[PDB]
Design a binder for these strands. Structure first.
Ligand SMILES: [Zn+2]
Ligand SMILES: [Zn+2]
Ligand SMILES: [Zn+2]
Ligand SMILES: [Zn+2]
Lengths: 527, 585, 187, 72, 186
RNA sequence: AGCUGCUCCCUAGCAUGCUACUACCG
RNA sequence: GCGGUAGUAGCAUGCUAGGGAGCAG
């Protein structure tokens, strides 16, 4: 057996000296180092693969899933999808690994190269009548973090993603190129996109109250039934391009490749019990389907389980009665009532989704009477369906909408004045910015002159702190500016000492002035 | 990426076709390429046309299109001729001085190391270029050594005798220990671990180091190593001090070191000091003296071979306290009376090729003659010694140059320290020859010693010379003088006490025939140093410059400490030799 | 572009122009030789301009077909490597026990998770601590998967050989302790 | 002051790792454990005792010549 | 860029145009100086264009090759800058506990195990001479890592346990000096 | 040694488009 | 004097490709 360790990140001392020169890192200050490069001992990989013991064979309430799936389906009727030919797939970064055992010969470029545009289609039409088991490799990530737990990511073999791309890519790239929907994958936070998103989810609810969450170990606590349902909801759009046997055999291939595939962790094969493998083609959208399913299930449970003799609004009581009727006393889909319930939800439960990181704006004078999901209902649902206890130290709830979500995608939201009106911007955790400045991987920094662009990007991400009331926050951006200035006017002098002419023209002065950076947070798109 | 050899200005062009690929100063690089056959240059990326299926390596035709380098028929419309302004594009082009005269470097780099003029150019030039020349000659001879055929053994005749075949199309190296082979045992997987051997005519005779059983299929090669770029100069700057620097003078004196201490203050009075060390004058005892003349000094015993440090180790087991000695041998059998691989020790005994990088109170460099400019500067790289002593003599055997073909290289031009020994003179001198009698010391003194060596005890009248003609017959790597082989037995019969004398020979295969006729032991002239015998005999065999030039004979004649036998077939030194001439039988 | 049939025409037109300019005969001569240079430029224009795009087109086509040929060659090497790896790894498995258990199936198809369990000729154990070692790999023989194995070549994390007498209770904290105990199938 | 301890623990672990200390699993496990506790510490005094314990590992071997490296 | 050859032609054409406009002589004669001056800036701006491009492209290529050289030599020397920066930080730390053990290890007292932190557990310290013993050990108390330890078992180099009281300046040249001393935390 | 999404920087190309100068013809 | 066409240079926008880097799940 082979034991793989995780090394510690290196130190960029010069930036630390500059930071302490400017009166930083003094005891009792708000900004402080918390994001470090942790190290791991020999048996780190297997001690993280062992976390799949939190996966238990679970039964689902079928007569309720057969309705939650209808509503989640209706949430996805705005887009389009279908099978695409070999000459239309779009693939970025063709020099990534090709999984096991293909990584012994070359990267993905070789295998995406040797197949002519007819071999790939022959394979993709072969898999619609056959099953191809594969072997997944398991690798650790090497990145800054605030917790000492390792992170393990699955490198799936090329024969899986090569066909999954063709099967799913039309719908995947139709989801990522739509604005104003529930899923917000692909919408950028620059040039006033974050403000648009936040004003989207506030749409028309009456007495709003924010609510968010995130799932503890989402990929490993996933039951198999919800993975299957998510894949079915994704593959539903192929009503015309494929037959019914073809769709079933493609689903069987998906279950054989991302649900119980023989993970090759270390130097020996194991059996992955269940849950998603995070390194396949459609993780970031299967997670969205999961999240919407849990939201709908929480709403269903919260409305059904209410004493229906105290409800005063007649319409919601009739909604309760018809909901139970079509849930248990019925057998076939009733699209009239599915539309009715979806309208009720989108009018009294607004949502924003990325891959399991959600934000919900709900009417509050209903949730206080249990007509919509509160934050306890998600605890109950996760308990009896996901087999995890949702700690109330990970779910927040906000009531003053002038301040946005307490946290979304690891960015806080602040309402500043930008020109004449007021906008919302994402500002990161300052310690994250400083920890990215100081700890690096041996040449990627520790000599700033060689890179400079990384400091430019970090100052781009750290701009919104400049409007923060906390004084110890803006000095981070100002320090970054002065460091870029020092780096540039030291590189010029050093090159001049090694040569006899200085850079004839650069127009680099825009980099160490705020005017280049304040243009990335104004609503006029210069790509 | 470093500074160029001639100009020391930082640069990034490296001479491609050149042997060791030195860092080339940009315009200085243009001079090197235009004045030599070295037309290939490599920067951080190589200057070769990157368009597929190309061959051109000459820099001049290469033009710069975008982020790459292009020949004439491969460019895009936008170009930038790199070979422009007489200045090839390269790093630090303006922080460049160039060189007005580079033809010395041009001849050094275009040198095949054929004549003595090559070594004259190497020695007469300055620090950086002499170091480059030494490295190039070492690498070039190491390259030719493996260019010869393989020494395969196909039949096993008997003990110490084998039948050997050789590779076709490549020649055969000589038949002496001058180039020690190194075979490995071939198995189904690979070839490993036989050892270092010397082959001589017997049918061949192998002289292995350790006990071994050689079977068929085992073949021996002249193993080569990778010569690495030297840094330090051969000699540190000279500086004469005003007091004894860094050492505490001794309280009491020893009569055997009375003649040592008189020359010892000036050793510690200055950075480095040179020696006039004749054979058998106690130079090893001179080196031992510094340890007794300075008990707290951490001195390091260094020489070209472990057998030469063995001489220093020979006098270490007697006078030096064994509790403070350390012999360093890399992982060959030799003296190991000390503890091995101990850097942190007072007395350190190691060969110049294996002592780690330390600091020394005062160094002793035994046998400086055979240590060329390569190992002259090797020691300074390892140690920045506070004091320096050069134990050896330019009037002593140098290393045998396998590439020197025409012209005999001058004794002064061996290396830097031996060069100054003939111009400013040696700083020390030991006036007593502790082995040779008046018949030998007086004669060798008038030869190259400036009549500076004087007799020790007596004129034993036991050294004899003979006049003769002889007819030579030669073979692949030897030459045997038959009449002298007839004479040697003829001379020894009429006095049975003469059979205790060892036979010395220039071409050791000549004595191999003599050893069959008589049975007296064998001596090699090139390696007769360190070993001396009271009774020893010699045959001149040839009068060519290889054997009986003035200085390569001085070791053989000084082997005997009472009397020696040598039949002069020549007349260049027979007239000068003050020996006794008898009748030819 | 100098061997085109335009270099000669331009040269003769300019030679006439310069000869008559030195002569300086008439203004109509100047007009005629200006018209000659004003019509011989279009000759030169498309005779040394379009041909400077044909070269670029030919070169880019040549590079593209070079790249395609290299792609095909890489395909050939990887095909050979994969076929030889399959053919060298299949020769280690076809024991008569595998054939025996494949013949006894009702259909010839047997689950994958029983082939090593019932035909493997070597067992690897991984033990995290002495307590687990005592219950499973105790002594020089142990029974797993309803067979008999004999312990051989016990090794530690550093992959150095550890003899069986060392693994006591008190000596346990002095060993690297993902012990990998190997064994073979006994009959 | 503690931030300096965290930074010096990081650089110390890097030099230890390039000294080829991970060839012996138990030593590397102890080193990584100590380094993780130093990085997650909230107060300065226990950081310093774990710091001296971690530095003793470097002092134990003979690979890092100390008298030269301490050149003041 | 003014040293280019065509600048002289441009200057001559400009001077001719200036003289003509200062004279205002004709209508077509100065048109010769618009069919020869506007032409004169056609072989100038085209010849002053690529050379300005060429200088910048040369500069950008040379600076990228410089950065490549710097990145190549910085990763070829990491295992001495690591140690030098380490010890510079350690000296800047100014902690007594580290200073004691660093001085001791510099003079010879290198512990042969991890220094334990609990009040239990054993420490094993080499003491290759007697002067080094004088400062650290005093009777039954061992002073190391700015802690207080209790000596229990000294041993010479040939693994022969030596009594504590025997060692003394007179009898110091009588034991195999690389002692190892077992002690426990206070 | 994974799947995405966003952003910054450098270069190359085609095409488009604009402006300026020259030549031919009407 | 106008238009058109053919060349040359410059500038802008955008689309594609290649390389480097950063952030979020
Ligand atoms: Zn389809
Ligand atoms: Zn050269
Ligand atoms: Zn130069
Ligand atoms: Zn070419």
């Amino acid at each position: 057996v082979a034991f793989q360790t995780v090394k510690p990140g290196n130190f960029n001392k010069d930036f630390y000296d500059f930071a302490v020169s400017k009166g930083f890192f003094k005891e009792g200050s708000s900004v402080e180092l918390k994001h470090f490069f942790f190290a791991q001992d020999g048996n780190a990989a297997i001690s993280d693969y062992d976390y799949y013991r939190y996966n238990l064979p679970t039964m689902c309430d079928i007569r309720q899933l057969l309705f939650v799936v209808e509503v989640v389906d209706k949430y996805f009727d705005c887009y389009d999808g279908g099978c695409i030919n070999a000459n239309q797939v779009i693939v970025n970064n063709l020099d990534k690994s090709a999984g096991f055992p293909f990584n012994k010969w070359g990267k993905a470029r070789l295998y995406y190269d040797s197949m002519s545009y007819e071999d790939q289609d022959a394979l993709f039409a072969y898999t619609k009548r056959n099953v191809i088991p594969t072997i997944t490799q398991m690798n650790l990530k090497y990145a800054i973090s605030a917790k000492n737990r390792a992170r393990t990511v699955a490198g799936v073999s090329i024969c899986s993603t090569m066909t999954n791309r063709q099967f799913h890519q039309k719908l995947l790239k139709s989801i990522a190129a739509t604005r104003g929907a529930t899923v917000v994958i692909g919408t950028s936070k620059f040039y006033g996109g974050w403000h648009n998103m936040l004003k989207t989810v506030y749409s028309d609810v009456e007495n709003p109250h924010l609510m968010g969450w995130d799932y503890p170990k989402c990929d490993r606590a996933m039951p198999n039934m919800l993975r299957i349902m998510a894949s079915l909801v994704l593959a539903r759009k192929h009503t015309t391009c494929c037959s019914l046997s073809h769709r079933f055999y493609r689903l069987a291939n998906e279950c054989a490749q991302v649900l119980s595939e023989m993970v090759m962790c270390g130097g020996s094969l194991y059996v992955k019990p269940g849950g998603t493998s995070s390194g396949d083609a459609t993780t970031a959208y299967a997670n969205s389907v999961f999240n919407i399913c849990q939201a709908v299930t929480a709403n269903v449970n919260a409305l059904l389980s209410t004493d229906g003799n105290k409800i005063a609004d007649k319409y919601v009581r009739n909604l309760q009665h018809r909901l139970y009727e079509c849930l248990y006393r019925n057998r076939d889909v009733d699209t009239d009532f599915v539309n009715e319930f979806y309208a009720y939800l989108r009018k009294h439960f607004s949502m924003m989704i990325l891959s399991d990181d959600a934000v919900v704006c709900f009417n509050s004078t209903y949730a206080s009477q249990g007509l919509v999901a509160s934050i306890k209902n998600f605890k109950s649902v996760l308990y009896y369906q996901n087999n995890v206890f949702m700690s109330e130290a990970k779910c927040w709830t906000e009531t003053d909408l002038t301040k946005g979500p307490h946290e979304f995608c690891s960015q806080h939201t602040m309402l500043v004045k930008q020109g004449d009106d007021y906008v919302y911007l994402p500002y990161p955790d300052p310690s994250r910015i400083l920890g990215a400045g100081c700890f690096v991987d041996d040449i990627v920094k520790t000599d700033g002159t060689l890179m400079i662009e990384r400091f430019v990007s970090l100052a781009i991400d750290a701009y919104p702190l400049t409007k923060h009331p906390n004084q110890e926050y803006a000095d981070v951006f100002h320090l970054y500016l002065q460091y870029i200035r020092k780096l540039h006017d030291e590189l010029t002098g050093h090159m001049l000492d090694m040569y006899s002419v200085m850079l004839t023209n650069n127009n680099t002065s825009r980099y160490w002035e705020p005017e280049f950076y304040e243009a990335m947070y104004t609503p006029h798109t210069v790509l | 990426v470093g500074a160029c050899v001639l100009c020391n200005s930082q640069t990034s062009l490296r001479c491609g076709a050149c042997i060791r690929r030195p860092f080339l100063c940009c315009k200085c690089c243009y001079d090197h390429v235009i004045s030599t056959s070295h037309k290939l240059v490599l920067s951080v990326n190589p200057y070769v046309c990157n368009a597929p299926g190309c061959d051109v390596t000459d820099v001049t035709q290469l033009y710069l299109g975008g982020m790459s380098y292009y020949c004439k028929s491969h460019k895009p419309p936008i170009s930038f001729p790199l070979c422009a302004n007489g200045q090839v594009f390269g790093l630090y082009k303006n922080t460049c001085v160039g060189s007005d005269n580079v033809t010395d470097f041009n001849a050094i780099a275009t040198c095949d190391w054929t004549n003595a003029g090559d070594y004259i150019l190497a020695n007469t030039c300055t620090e950086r270029l002499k170091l480059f020349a030494a490295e190039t000659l070492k690498a070039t001879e190491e390259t030719f050594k493996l260019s010869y055929g393989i020494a395969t053994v196909r039949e096993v005749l008997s003990d110490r005798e084998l039948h050997l075949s050789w590779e076709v199309g490549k020649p055969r190296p000589p038949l002496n220990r001058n180039y020690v082979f190194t075979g490995y045992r071939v198995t189904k997987n690979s070839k490993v671990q036989i050892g270092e051997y010397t082959f001589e005519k017997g049918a061949v005779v192998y002289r292995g180091t350790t006990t071994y059983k050689l079977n068929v299929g085992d073949y021996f090669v002249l193993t080569s190593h990778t010569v690495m770029p030297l840094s330090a100069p051969t000699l540190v700057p000279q500086e004469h001090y005003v007091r004894i620097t860094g050492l505490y003078p001794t309280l009491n004196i020893s009569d055997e070191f009375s003649s040592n201490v008189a020359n010892y203050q000036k050793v510690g009075m200055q950075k480095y000091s040179t020696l006039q060390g004749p054979p058998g004058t106690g130079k090893s005892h001179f080196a031992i003296g510094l340890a007794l003349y300075y008990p707290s000094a951490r001195i390091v015993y260094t020489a070209c071979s472990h057998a030469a440090v063995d001489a220093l180790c020979e006098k270490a087991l007697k006078y030096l306290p064994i509790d403070k000695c350390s012999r360093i041998i890399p992982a060959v059998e030799c003296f190991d009376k000390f503890k091995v691989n101990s850097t942190l020790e007072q007395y350190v005994f190691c060969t110049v090729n294996a002592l780690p990088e330390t600091t020394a109170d005062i160094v002793v460099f035994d046998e400086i003659s055979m240590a060329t400019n390569y190992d002259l500067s090797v020691v300074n790289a390892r140690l920045r010694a506070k004091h320096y002593v050069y134990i050896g003599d330019p009037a002593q055997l140098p290393a045998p140059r396998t590439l020197l073909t025409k012209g005999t290289l001058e004794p002064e031009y061996f290396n830097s320290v031996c060069r100054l020994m003939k111009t400013i003179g040696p700083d020390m001198f030991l006036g007593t020859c502790r082995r040779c009698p008046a018949e030998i010391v007086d004669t060798v003194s008038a030869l190259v010693y400036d009549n500076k060596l004087k007799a020790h005890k007596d004129k034993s009248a036991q050294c004899f010379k003979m006049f003769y003609k002889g007819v030579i017959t030669h073979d692949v790597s030897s030459a045997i003088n038959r009449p002298q082989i007839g004479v040697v037995r003829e001379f020894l019969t009429r006095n049975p006490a003469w059979r205790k004398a060892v036979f010395i020979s220039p071409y050791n295969s000549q004595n191999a025939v003599a050893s069959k006729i008589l049975g007296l032991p064998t001596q090699t002239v090139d390696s007769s140093q360190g070993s001396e015998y009271d009774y020893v005999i010699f045959t001149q065999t040839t009068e060519t410059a290889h054997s009986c030039n003035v200085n390569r004979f001085n070791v053989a004649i000084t082997r005997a400490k009472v009397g020696i036998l040598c039949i002069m077939s020549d007349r260049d030194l027979y007239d000068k030799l003050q020996f006794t001439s008898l009748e030819i039988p | 572009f100098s061997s085109l049939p335009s270099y000669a025409a331009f040269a003769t037109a300019q030679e006439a122009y310069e000869q008559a300019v030195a002569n300086g005969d008439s203004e109509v001569v100047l007009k005629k030789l200006k018209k000659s240079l004003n019509v011989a430029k279009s000759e030169f224009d498309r005779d040394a301009a379009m041909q400077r795009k044909l070269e670029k087109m030919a070169d880019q086509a040549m590079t593209q077909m070079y790249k395609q040929a290299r792609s095909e060659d890489k395909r050939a090497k990887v095909t050979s490597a994969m076929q030889t790896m399959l053919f060298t790894m299949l020769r280690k498995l076809d024991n008569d026990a595998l054939n025996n258990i494949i013949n006894n199936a009702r259909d010839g198809c047997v689950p994958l998770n029983i082939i090593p369990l019932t035909t493997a000729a070597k067992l690897m154990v991984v033990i995290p601590d002495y307590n687990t070692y005592k219950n499973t790999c105790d002594g020089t023989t142990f029974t797993y998967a309803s067979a008999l194995w004999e312990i051989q070549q016990v090794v530690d994390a550093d992959s150095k050989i550890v003899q069986l007498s060392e693994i006591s209770m008190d000596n346990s904290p002095n060993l690297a302790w993902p012990l990998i105990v190997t064994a073979l199938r006994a009959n | 002051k503690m931030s300096d301890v965290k930074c010096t623990s990081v650089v110390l672990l890097s030099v230890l790792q390039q000294l080829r200390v991970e060839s012996s699993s138990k030593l590397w496990a102890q080193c990584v454990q100590l380094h993780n506790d130093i990085l997650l510490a909230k107060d300065t005094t226990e950081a310093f005792e774990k710091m001296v314990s971690l530095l003793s590992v470097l002092l134990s071997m003979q690979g890092a010549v100390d008298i030269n490296k301490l050149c003041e």
